[PDB]
Amino acid sequence: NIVTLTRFVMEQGRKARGTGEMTQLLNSLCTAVKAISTAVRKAGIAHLYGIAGKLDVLSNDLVINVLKSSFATCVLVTEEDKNAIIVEPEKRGKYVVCFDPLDGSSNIDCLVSIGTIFGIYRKNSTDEPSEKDALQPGRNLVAAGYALYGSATMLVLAMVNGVNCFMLDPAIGEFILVDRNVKIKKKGSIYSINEGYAKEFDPAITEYIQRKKFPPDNSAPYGARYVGSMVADVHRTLVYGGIFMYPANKKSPKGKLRLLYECNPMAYVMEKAGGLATTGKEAVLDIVPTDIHQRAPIILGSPEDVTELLEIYQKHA
Amino acid sequence: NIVTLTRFVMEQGRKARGTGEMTQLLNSLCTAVKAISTAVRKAGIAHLYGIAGKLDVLSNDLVINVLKSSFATCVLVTEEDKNAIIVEPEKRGKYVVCFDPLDGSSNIDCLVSIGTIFGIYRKNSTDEPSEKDALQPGRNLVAAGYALYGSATMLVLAMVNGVNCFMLDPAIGEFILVDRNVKIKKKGSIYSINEGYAKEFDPAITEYIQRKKFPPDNSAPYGARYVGSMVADVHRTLVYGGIFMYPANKKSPKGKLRLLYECNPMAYVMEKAGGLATTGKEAVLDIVPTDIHQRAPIILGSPEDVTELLEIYQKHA
Amino acid sequence: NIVTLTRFVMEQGRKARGTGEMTQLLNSLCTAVKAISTAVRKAGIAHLYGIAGKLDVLSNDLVINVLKSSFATCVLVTEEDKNAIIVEPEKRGKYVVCFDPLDGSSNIDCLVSIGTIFGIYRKNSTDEPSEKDALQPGRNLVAAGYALYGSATMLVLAMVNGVNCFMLDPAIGEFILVDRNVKIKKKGSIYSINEGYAKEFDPAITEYIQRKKFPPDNSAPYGARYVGSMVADVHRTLVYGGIFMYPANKKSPKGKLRLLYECNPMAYVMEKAGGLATTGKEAVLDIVPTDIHQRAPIILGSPEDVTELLEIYQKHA
Amino acid sequence: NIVTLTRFVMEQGRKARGTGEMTQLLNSLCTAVKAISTAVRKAGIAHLYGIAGKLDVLSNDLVINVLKSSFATCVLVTEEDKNAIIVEPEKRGKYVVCFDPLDGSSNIDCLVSIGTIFGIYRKNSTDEPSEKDALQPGRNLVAAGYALYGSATMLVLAMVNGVNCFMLDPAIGEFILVDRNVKIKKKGSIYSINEGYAKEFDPAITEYIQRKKFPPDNSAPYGARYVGSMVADVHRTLVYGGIFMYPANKKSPKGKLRLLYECNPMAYVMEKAGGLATTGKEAVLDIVPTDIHQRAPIILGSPEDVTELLEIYQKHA
Ligand SMILES: Nc1ncnc2c1ncn2[C@@H]1O[C@H](COP(=O)(O)O)[C@@H](O)[C@H]1O
Ligand SMILES: Nc1ncnc2c1ncn2[C@@H]1O[C@H](COP(=O)(O)O)[C@@H](O)[C@H]1O
Ligand SMILES: Nc1ncnc2c1ncn2[C@@H]1O[C@H](COP(=O)(O)O)[C@@H](O)[C@H]1O
Ligand SMILES: Nc1ncnc2c1ncn2[C@@H]1O[C@H](COP(=O)(O)O)[C@@H](O)[C@H]1O
Ligand SMILES: O=P(O)(O)OC[C@@H]1O[C@H](COP(=O)(O)O)[C@@H](O)[C@@H]1O
Ligand SMILES: O=P(O)(O)OC[C@@H]1O[C@H](COP(=O)(O)O)[C@@H](O)[C@@H]1O
Ligand SMILES: O=P(O)(O)OC[C@@H]1O[C@H](COP(=O)(O)O)[C@@H](O)[C@@H]1O
Ligand SMILES: O=P(O)(O)OC[C@@H]1O[C@H](COP(=O)(O)O)[C@@H](O)[C@@H]1O
Ligand SMILES: [K+]
Ligand SMILES: [K+]
Ligand SMILES: [K+]
Ligand SMILES: [K+]
Ligand SMILES: [K+]
Ligand SMILES: [K+]
Ligand SMILES: [K+]
Ligand SMILES: [K+]
Ligand SMILES: [K+]
Ligand SMILES: [K+]
Ligand SMILES: [K+]
Ligand SMILES: [K+]
């Protein structure tokens, strides 16, 4: 007995008495992710080096085309695209998909772990599809998750029912359910943040970090980790517990991370896992988007760690 | 045209006029690296999950076995083995290999980049091979390098004539020379260190760090990055420039990283690349080891960055 | 735009307003076939040769376990199994699957193309499942097809709607629809038969062959081809046209090929393609099985070629 | 222990005391074979089918390019090229390679086993390399063998010291020595020939064939097998014993198969394996060619079987 992503999705679609439109969608995503994974591990690079005689772009095209061919979407929002992609009426479905085809594109040259981030909305309204359909608060997410191309490829899927992790067996090109109904640690022992912006941190953030290195109660300090790729940092948080942070500073007073295809999908995954995702002031998933490429500060991870910072945030209020 | 590791290695062996003994060794190493990469990528995991019909220990076995069969080694030092392995008189060769089969094994469950580290010495004290033969300063390295199992697999090889990077094309199981004679930037813009040990840093490290976040002349501060995997962090340093640091602290008064199979190979690669690798007080490669599992502090990266920290070390003494 | 087997099956299940039970079944088969394909191409053979320190049996276990885990079957008939496999009431579905996990097992050692043959029946009755449920004439087939592990892996699926061919892209482990609604040639130019049994052929067969080598109308003779693996021979017939034959002789007066999991699936595929499948006397698909391992003579291929022999058969009646 | 082609080849080069020039050649060949196997298995075909973002010509380019870069060849003869290719003075070596990049190209669309055939001569007439250098009897072969892309990929290598079979482990892209010093059965029980040419067979062939179906002393008749792919049929002959025949006929008065890149390599492999390879009148390897694309009749296989046919040839003369 072994559970594959294809089996899992189908059984979940069956229990939910769906028309099978969303299952077609999730199966198309699974395929896109396997295609991207293969391109990322450099299969066929020899030909590029003349054996017989861009990566973010290839990833964008793969997701966009595999998604359109699902006949289950009406609007697509990509980080690589200025405007939202409205699906041809021939292949038009009822879902809105926001995604980041290849996050951590800067890390590509250094071979650091990268990934794909996606969020699925059910179109709410009854008129010609437009960018306005993507502009829904993260709380309205039908499904969300990510694919991490690290030492191994893994797809983390989060739905109303919970969070489940699927490992890619590259030998047979099938995702195996290796961890079901994942719940995050209450309190971790690692903080993640680009301390190279110390000079720009607000007093609350500055205080929290200081508390981590120099525990006032003289407990053991927190270990530091900052890969540089959100999917890698956040996935480690989900699995090992702790706190990831990318608050505002000179690098945009609105933070760097995007709301629709980065913050929301990860916040959704986090909350479903039993953790928190805040901007320091409000819950990320309750923000009403104003633009499809709207940025937003984010602090996420173990509940007890995120709450501790939230208090320090209140102190300086 | 297309250059494969196999062709490159043989070609170099010929120019060098070797008896082809080292070529056999480097060829065996290459084979061990492709076997580990495959295991790491989780190929065939569906079989563990009951489709019907460890990773560090497996990596250890692969490297040991594949090396012994090369008939080119006499002494082997693994991080996984308390004692140095002495090869059978039947399979003995003139080379001593010091390696770390799978480095960053804590990051495995989190799916973060990991790797293999190797250092090759030539047994000169023609006596019965013993542990003593591995106890040579890194200055005596014949060849050294590493394999990074990140988003893609790469093998960095360093020898007297330079450093060369080989990307693995998993389709055909061939390493392609993607970068020739690699040389690191004089000055970088990223510092790498576990700041969670701030409470235990010596005044030199403490001053340098704060100088990176708050630059005297108001210039751009350095970005921070700390994957938690030496091979990953050092490769980023090599490719993008900057400085990696794992100084001595209370928990590790002599540092955490090992001299023979971690510090030395990376120090050797750094020097051949045109960078510096120091203990803070002296060059890593000149240290004459006393224990095969001897630890050593390490600071490496761009020359200009490493020098700056070395001056601060001189200032506080 | 590209069609995958997973997409195809789902859309076909949707048009047919199924409960999704048979789709779960076809998806489980797709997975089993990819697993077998990988084992056949020898991935991981190095470990068997001690790098770090039966095939028909593995194939049987894979299909049996992957099928049971579909929760869509009640009875399974395998060539490798003396008795039919009755599914545990926990995983019991409504379908009966007859199959040959690895046909041409004798050819394995010679590396000749081999394959998998399957036929799907819908249980007809309302009582405890038993072998009796498998004993239905081939005309009652819901679906049938085969997987050919040759120069490339291909799955041919035949249903009431038609015959469609899917090519396995081993890089992403996905079956691509490369040929839809396949129809066989009216008249081919190749005959396939083990002429090493000439001494045992009945006069009709003997006459046909003679007509092929020495055309009475002085037309061009037929080329000969006999791979030795039914799936390979039959697939070539389906694609290039011609006639495949395995009539009775001293090698059992009932022929060698099995009715349920070899003759029927291939006859079904053939008829759906626009060809014929006969025992010389009757249509293969109309035979009422008496035993699950019942053998049956078979002549299949292009209509005009099969009819020509049928006449010669009548002449000698 | 585990023996890889790479290790085996180098080891043999060392014992032979070669300048490592031929080793480079055999290493390049090996690389070309893994590239062809991958293309043949249809890896990445999903990209032709619009997932968004020949085979014989491609195989030709791969072999030519990978061989030229080995800096070990001066003259190349391909079935795909009318004229012999003369390597640039810059990349020239002392070896002449005669090859058939992808044999059985008619069987491609039918997915039947196909392969690569190669013969290696040493240029002895030290003059400007020309077509003349390839015109040497197969008796002058330094090395010969083939790659079979069947159910699994295998590389058969034959040299003065014997014939060795290497199985490809596609996971790690390594050829493993699965069979050492291969030697064919004295007598087989399978005859291989296209009997569709019965109307044009000489009385010797005709008598031998009928003697196989109707044995004088009532013994068991021979089984028939004719894949239609030389490499596949010859490999079956090598592994299981028997006789392969492609005699001269009206359509091919001098046979169909080429001397330099088909007959010779297989004849060489046969002789080293302990079998016989005849034209019916003389040994294939002793023929001094006049044309690079010269055809030649061929009969090969177990010694006892080939001898029997040779006696019948003597009887009718
Ligand atoms: N694979 C599935 N897994 C879980 N829920 C699903 C699945 N498919 C559909 N649903 C649900 O049923 C609703 C409508 O599905 P659908 O008819 O396919 O568009 C969805 O939005 C979810 O509530
Ligand atoms: N592949 C090679 N590349 C560069 N130098 C080599 C190679 N093989 C051997 N050498 C060198 O020649 C010395 C002796 O080689 P060997 O005779 O193979 O043990 C080595 O220790 C290096 O100095
Ligand atoms: N994937 C499918 N493709 C074509 N027909 C299907 C599919 N699934 C179910 N059917 C059909 O609908 C009947 C009952 O399906 P089911 O409810 O899934 O057992 C089948 O036996 C076929 O007639
Ligand atoms: N890998 C090898 N295995 C067996 N014999 C070899 C090998 N390499 C070279 N030789 C032989 O030594 C001769 C000259 O080799 P080379 O100096 O490499 O051109 C060859 O033509 C063969 O006789
Ligand atoms: O994909 P991008 O545009 O290159 O950025 C990725 C994001 O960039 C963040 C790190 O940025 P800093 O270097 O400012 O810390 C990560 O958390 C995210 O992956
Ligand atoms: O393989 P190990 O024993 O788990 O250690 C890996 C090393 O551990 C260092 C980080 O350890 P800290 O958490 O102490 O910083 C990295 O630089 C190296 O990769
Ligand atoms: O799988 P098996 O039991 O080894 O047999 C395979 C079948 O065996 C037939 C050939 O048998 P002959 O050698 O008698 O021709 C093929 O047509 C079929 O693939
Ligand atoms: O590559 P080609 O030109 O298509 O020919 C392949 C050869 O053709 C022979 C069979 O041809 P016939 O159909 O004439 O028997 C086989 O033995 C060889 O593989
Ligand atoms: K991006
Ligand atoms: K991004
Ligand atoms: K971003
Ligand atoms: K380790
Ligand atoms: K380590
Ligand atoms: K260590
Ligand atoms: K079988
Ligand atoms: K069989
Ligand atoms: K059978
Ligand atoms: K050809
Ligand atoms: K040919
Ligand atoms: K030919």
**CATH classification of the domain holding C306:** 3.40.190.80
Mutate which of C22, C28, C71, C160 for ligand 3 pocket (most atoms within 8 A of beta carbon): C22
Ligand 10 is an ion; residues with CB less than 5 A from it: A 103
Whole-number CA gyration radius for chain C: 20
Q: Are residues C210 and C311 in the same domain?
A: yes
Give residues whose Cβ lies within 5 Å of ion ligand 15.
C 79, 105
C245-271 as b/e: b if 16+ CB within 10 A: bbbbbeeeeebbbbbbbbbbbbbbbbb
Measured between beta carbons, the chain D residues lying within 8 angstroms of C169 are 42-46
Distance D163 CA to ligand 6 centre (A): 49
Chains in touch with A (3+ beta-carbon pairs under 8 Å) read: B, C, D
Is residue A279 exposed (0-12), middle (13-18) or buried (19+ Cβ within 10 Å)?
A: buried
Q: What phi and psi, each to the nearest 5 degrees, are found at residue C312? A: -60, -35
Q: Are D309 and D204 in contact (CB under 8 A)?
A: yes
- φ/ψ (deg, to 5) at A245: -140, 140
From CA C191, how far away is CA C242, in angstroms rounded? 6
| Residue A24 vs residues A66, A159, B230, C22, C174: alpha-carbon distances, Å | 11, 16, 42, 16, 15
Q: Decide: residue B77, CB within 10 A, 0-12 exposed, 13-18 middle, 19+ buried.
A: buried
| Interface test mutation site (partner D, options C112, C151, C218, C219, max chain D beta carbons within 10 A) | C151
The full 3-state SS of chain C, as one line of letters, equals CCCEHHHHHHHHHHHCCCCCHHHHHHHHHHHHHHHHHHHHCCCCHHHHCCCCCCHHHHHHHHHHHHHHCCCCEEEEEECCCCCCEECCCCCECCEEEEEEEEECHHHHHHCCCEEEEEEEEECCCCCCCCHHHCCCCHHHCCEEEEEEECCCEEEEEEECCEEEEEEEECCCCEEEEEECCCCCCCCCCEEECCHHHHHHCCHHHHHHHHHHHCCCCCCCCCEECECCCHHHHHHHHHHHCCEEEECCCCCCCCCCCEHHHHHHHHHHHHHHCCCEEECCCCEHHHCCCCCCCCECCEEEECHHHHHHHHHHHHHCC
Asked if C115 contacts C236 with a C-beta cutoff of 8 angstroms, the reply is no
**What are the structure tokens assigned to C202, written together?**
């009945």
Q: Which helix (H) or strand (E) holds B231?
A: helix B230-240
Residues D24 and D68 in one domain: yes
Best residue in C9, C172, C176 to probe A by mutation, most A CBs within 10 Å? C172
What gap in Å lies between CA B270 and CA B163, rounded to an integer? 9
Q: To the nearest 10°, report the CA torsion of C121, C125, C126, C128.
A: -70
| Three-class DSSP category at A284 | helix
Whether C151 and C50 map to the same domain: the answer is: yes
User: Which phi and psi (to 5°) does residue A93 adopt?
Assistant: -115, -160
Contacting residues for D127 by C-beta, under 8 A, at least 6 apart:
none
CA angle A103, A108, A113 (to 5 degrees): 65
D1 with D135, same domain? yes
DSSP 8-state secondary structure symbol assigned to residue D226: B
Rounded Cα gap, residues D151 and D149, in angstroms: 7
Short-list C227, B152, A181, C96, CA closest to D112: C227
C-beta of residue D194 within 8 angstroms of C-beta of residue C223: yes
CA distance C128 to B178: 64
Residues of A in contact with C170 (CB under 8 A): 173
Q: Which DSSP state fits D262?
A: I
**Last residue of one domain, picked from the residues C126, C147, C181:** C181
| Residue D240 Cα to ligand 10 middle (Å) | 59
DSSP, collapsed to helix, strand or coil, labels residue D240 as helix
Structure tokens at C97: 């699957």
Q: What radius of gyration, in Å, describes the C-alpha atoms of chain D?
A: 20
Alpha-carbon distances of C39 from A33, A77, C42, D37, D151, rounded to whole Å: 24, 41, 5, 16, 10
Q: Copy the structure tokens of residue B123.
A: 């047994």
- What amino acid occupies position A106? S
Going by the DSSP 8-state scheme, the letter that residue A59 receives in this structure is: H
Torsion sign, CA atoms A304, A306, A308, A310: negative
Residues D80 and D144 reside in one and the same domain: yes
Q: How far apart are CA D301 and CA C215, in angstroms?
A: 31
B190-192/B243-246 β-pairing: parallel
Angle B15-B20-B24 from CA coordinates, rounded to 5°: 120
Sign of CA dihedral C100, C106, C108, C112: negative
Give dist(CA C302, CA A8) in Å, integer: 42
Burial group, residue A160, by CB count within 10 angstroms (0-12, 13-18, 19+): exposed
Q: Which domain holds residue D254?
A: 182-316
Closest CA to A32 of A153, A163, A200: A153
Compute, in degrees rounded to 10, the torsion defined by CA atoms D216, D218, D220, D222: 20
Q: Alpha-carbon distance B119 to B132, whole Å?
A: 16
Give the whole-angstrom CA distance, residue C274 versus residue C303.
7
Contact B111, A165 (CB under 8 A): no
Classify residue B189 by its DSSP letter. S
Least Cα separation, residue C17 to chain B (angstroms): 30
CA–CA separation, A243 and A305 (whole Å): 6
CATH number (domain holding residue C143): 3.30.540.10
Same domain as C197, residue C147: no
The beta-carbon neighbor of D65 closest among A52, A64, A66 is A52
Please provide residue C119's backbone torsions phi and psi, each rounded to the nearest 5 degrees: -140, 135
Cα-Cα end-to-end distance for chain C = 54
3-state secondary structure of A114: strand
Å from CA of A231 to ligand 10 middle: 10
Helices within D203-290 (DSSP H only) = 203-213, 230-240, 264-272
Tokens of B205: 């490290």
Chains contacting C with at least 3 CB pairs below 8 Å? A, B, D
One-letter identity of residue C184? I
Q: Which 3 state secondary structure label does DSSP give A107? A: helix
- Cα C219 to ligand 18 centre (Å): 28
**What's the domain count of chain A?**
2
Encoding tokens for residue A216?
């006032």
Q: What is the CA radius of gyration of chain B?
A: 20
C100 Cα–ligand 15 center, Å: 6
Tell me the one-letter amino acid at B181. Answer: N
Domain endpoint, select from A181, A215, A244? A181
C117 and C264, same domain (yes or no):
no
Question: How many angstroms separate the Cα of C61 from the Cα of each of C21, C67, C82, C262?
Answer: 22, 10, 15, 19
Count of CA atoms in the C-beta half-sphere (13 A) of B284: 36
Find the discontinuities in chain C where C to next N exceeds 2.5 angstroms and give the residue preceding each: 53
Phi–psi pair at B16, nearest 5 degrees: -75, -20
Q: Are B165 and B154 a contacting pair, CB within 8 Å?
A: yes
Q: Whose CA is nearest to atom 10 of ligand 8?
A: D228
- C231 exposed, middle or buried (CB, 10 Å; 0-12, 13-18, 19+)? buried
Q: Please give the Cα distance from B289 to B262 (Å, whole number).
A: 13
Regarding whether A191 and A173 lie in a shared domain, the answer is: no
Structural domain ending residue among the three candidates C132, C163, C181: C181
| Tokens, residue C99 | 């199959």
Q: By the 8 A CB rule, do D205 and D247 touch?
A: yes
* CA proximity to D59, closest of D38, D85, D44: D38
| Inter-chain touch D35–A50, beta carbons under 8 Å | no
Residues A158 and A12 sit within 8 Å (Cβ to Cβ): no
Q: Helix (H, G, I), strand (E, B), or coil: what is residue D135?
A: coil
Q: Is C202 exposed, middle or buried (0-12, 13-18, 19+ CB in 10 A)?
A: middle
CB D237 less than 6 A from any atom of ligand 4: no
Separation of alpha carbons A46 and A129, rounded Å: 43
CA distances from B232 to B154, B165, B229, B245, C254 (A): 11, 14, 5, 13, 66
For residue A244, list its beta bridge partners: A192, A300
Structure method: X-ray
Ligand 8 atom showing the smallest separation from residue D194 Cα: 15
Distance CA C163, CA C146 (A): 11
Asked whether residue C276 falls in the same domain as residue C145, the answer is no
**Tokens 């070539």 correspond to what residue?**
C236
Selected for mutation to probe chain B from D1, D3, D10 (highest B CB count within 10 Å) is D10
A41/A172 same-domain check: yes
Residue nearest to atom 1 of ligand 1 (CA): A13
User: CA D307 to CA D214: how far, in whole Å?
Assistant: 19
Please tell me the distance from the alpha carbon of residue A43 to that of residue D34, in angstroms, as a whole number.
Answer: 13
- Nearest Cα neighbor of A28 from A84, A86, A95 is A95
Half-sphere exposure of B269 (CA within 13 A, CB side): 29
Helix, strand, or coil here: B179? strand
Q: CB of A86 within 8 A of CB of A109?
A: no
Written as six digits, the tokens of C317 are: 């009646």
Task: Verify whether ligand 4 is closer than 6 Å to residue D106 (CB atom).
Answer: no
Q: Are residues D11 and D158 in the same domain?
A: yes
Tokens of D209: 């064939």
Q: Is B29 exposed, middle or buried (0-12, 13-18, 19+ CB in 10 A)?
A: buried
CB A58 within 8 Å of CB A138: no
Residues C145 and C207 in one domain: no
